[PDB]
Design a protein around this ligand. Sequence first.
Ligand SMILES: *[C@H](O)[C@H](C[C@@H]1CCNC1=O)NC(=O)[C@H](CC1CC1)NC(=O)[C@@H](NC(=O)OCc1ccccc1)C(C)(C)C
Ligand SMILES: *[C@H](O)[C@H](C[C@@H]1CCNC1=O)NC(=O)[C@H](CC1CC1)NC(=O)[C@@H](NC(=O)OCc1ccccc1)C(C)(C)C
Lengths: 306, 306
Amino acid sequence: SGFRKMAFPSGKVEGCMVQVTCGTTTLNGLWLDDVVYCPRHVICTSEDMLNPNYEDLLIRKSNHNFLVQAGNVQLRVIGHSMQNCVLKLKVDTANPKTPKYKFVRIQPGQTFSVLACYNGSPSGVYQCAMRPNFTIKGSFLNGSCGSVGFNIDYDCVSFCYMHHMELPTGVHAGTDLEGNFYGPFVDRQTAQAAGTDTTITVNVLAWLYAAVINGDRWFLNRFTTTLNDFNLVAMKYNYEPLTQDHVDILGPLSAQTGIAVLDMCASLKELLQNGMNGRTILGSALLEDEFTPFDVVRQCSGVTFQ
Amino acid sequence: SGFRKMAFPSGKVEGCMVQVTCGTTTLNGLWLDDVVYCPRHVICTSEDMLNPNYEDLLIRKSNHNFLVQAGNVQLRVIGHSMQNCVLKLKVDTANPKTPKYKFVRIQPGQTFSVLACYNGSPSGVYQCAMRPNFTIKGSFLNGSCGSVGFNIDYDCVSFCYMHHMELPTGVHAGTDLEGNFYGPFVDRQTAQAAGTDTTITVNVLAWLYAAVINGDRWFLNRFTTTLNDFNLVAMKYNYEPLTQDHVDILGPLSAQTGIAVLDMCASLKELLQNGMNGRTILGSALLEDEFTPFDVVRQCSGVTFQ
Ligand SMILES: *[C@H](O)[C@H](C[C@@H]1CCNC1=O)NC(=O)[C@H](CC1CC1)NC(=O)[C@@H](NC(=O)OCc1ccccc1)C(C)(C)C
Ligand SMILES: *[C@H](O)[C@H](C[C@@H]1CCNC1=O)NC(=O)[C@H](CC1CC1)NC(=O)[C@@H](NC(=O)OCc1ccccc1)C(C)(C)C
C-alpha cells in the first residue's frame, strides 16, 4: 500500500553524465557511445545569450575549446556538430557504461524522471510531467543545463528531455534529445511566456483510481454522467477534454476497482463543483495530475527494471 | 527555481541489491563486501509469521537453503548469523560495486531516500520522512521487504532503513541496518498499532522558507510571537514542540531570507488558526512537513554527490 511520487532508479543515467566546459560556461553533457550531447548555448557567454547566432558562433570554435570531464578523466573531443538546439561532441572514447537507449519525444500529460546534475555530478532525482503548455515544473538552479529526463522500460533508457532554461514563472523549458524544443520556446534570453496551462484530466482520474486502490473512498458517489456532460464541466474548470481513448486507457484501472470510468468522472465533477471540504486524497488537499494511468498501474503492481 | 520532493541518485545502492530466496519466501538483500543483509523473516513461511521463534528456526537452516541471486549470478552462501531482526549471509564473493558506506540510525523528523525493489531489481526511488511515531508513509507491495532507505553525503552512503512490514493504516515499519526496529514494532504478524502521530514543526518552517526563496510570500505577516506562545498553538494543532535548537538550525534559512524564525512562527500560527483560504504554497494546499532544513538548503543551493 501507499502512493508516492516515484522516479525511476537513476543508476543507468548517472553513468552517462559528464561536465562540459567551454569558455566560462560550465554545464552537463550526456555521454552515449562516443558522443557527448549538451545544450548548444555552451558556446555562448553571458553577453551572447541575449540575442545569439549559433551557426556563426560554432564555426569559430575548435575541438580543444571543449573541456569534457568524465569523473576525473579527460575526454578528448575529436569532432563537433550542432543538431537543432543541442551540440554533439565527438569524443575518442566510447562510454563503457552506455546503457541500451532510445531518443523519444513525449506528449504533454506524460511523466518522466529528471536527474538533476551540477558540474557533471548528479544532485537528485524527481518525477514530473510535461505540462499541456509544454513547460515542466522542475527544480533547477544555475549550472543544471544539460540535465536529462528519461523513462526506463525493463533495461532500456528512453531519454526524452534535456534542460535548457527557466521562464519568468519559475517553470522550465527544454528540448528532446534531437535538440527540438518542447513548446514555442527558443534558447535566447528574450522575453518568453509559458502560455496558459490546463489540468491533465486523464491523470487526475488515474490518481483517483490509485486512491480507491489504497482505500480512500469518500469522494465516490452514486451518480453518473455522460462524456459530453463531463467535458462541459471540464472546460468550465480549465481541465483538458477527456476522449474515448482516455476512457479506454483507464479501462484496466476501472476493471481492478469495479468503478466505471464515467462513474469516476461523476465523482471528479462533484469534487470540482464542491471542493474537498477539508478532506484529503492520498495525502493531498488538491487534485493531483502528474500521475499517468501507467504510473498508477506500475506502482500498484510493482513493475521493476534493470 | 522550483521545489520538488527530491531523492538521492540511487546508482550506488542499485549495485548492492540482490535477491534472497529461502523456501517459498523471496525478498531483497543488501550486498556489501562479502555479506548480504536481509530481513530475518525470510526464514519464515506464511504460517510461521503469525508467532515465530527465529532462533529455533535458524539453527534448522543450512547455507545451501539460501539462494542469493546477484543479477543472474549465483552467490555461494558460506555462513550465516542473525543480528537482531536482520540476517547476515556470508558469501564467498565481495561485491565489487560496494560503495563507501556507514550504518546510521536516524531520528524522527529526518528524511531519506527509499529504493523500492522486487526480486532484487529496483522499481523506483522516492523520498520520505521518519514520522514522530516511527512509521514511514512509504509505497511498498508484497516482495518489497529488504528494500533500503539511505542518505548520501558526497561519496558515502549512509544506510538507515530496511523495510520489514506494513501496518493496518497503510504505513510501514522497519529496522536500522543493525536489525533494531524503529518504534515499538516486532517482526510478527500480530496486531500492532502505529500510535498517534504529530506534524514535524521544524520541517514545516523549513518548507515555508523554501516557499519564500521561491517567491510564495502571501502567508507572511507583520506579526510576531514568542517561542512559548507559539508552542501553545503548536500543541493545540498536534504539532511537535519547537526548541531553541530548531530555531538555531533554521538560522541560515532565516539569514538568507531576512525573516526571523519567530516571525515565521507567527505566520505558521496564522496558517494554523485560519487555513489557507484556497491559496497554495509551493503547489500544495497542505502544510508540508517531510522537508528538513538541510533538504531545503541542499535543493536551493545545489549540493551534489558522487
Ligand atoms: C543552464 O544551466 C541554465 C539553467 C537555468 C538557470 C536558472 N534555472 C535554470 O533552469 N539556463 C540558462 O541560464 C538559460 C540560458 C539561455 C537559454 C540560453 N537562461 C535562462 O534560463 C534565463 N531565462 C531566460 O532568459 O528566459 C526567460 C525570460 C528572459 C527574459 C525576459 C523574460 C523571460 C534566466 C534568466 C533564468 C537565466
Ligand atoms: C515483505 O516483502 C512484506 C512487505 C509488506 C507486504 C505488503 N506491504 C508491505 O510492506 N512484509 C510482510 O509480509 C510482513 C512480514 C511479517 C513481518 C514478518 N508482514 C506484513 O507486513 C503484514 N503486516 C502485519 O502482519 O502487521 C500488522 C498487523 C497484523 C495483524 C493484525 C493487525 C495488524 C501484512 C498483513 C501487511 C502482510
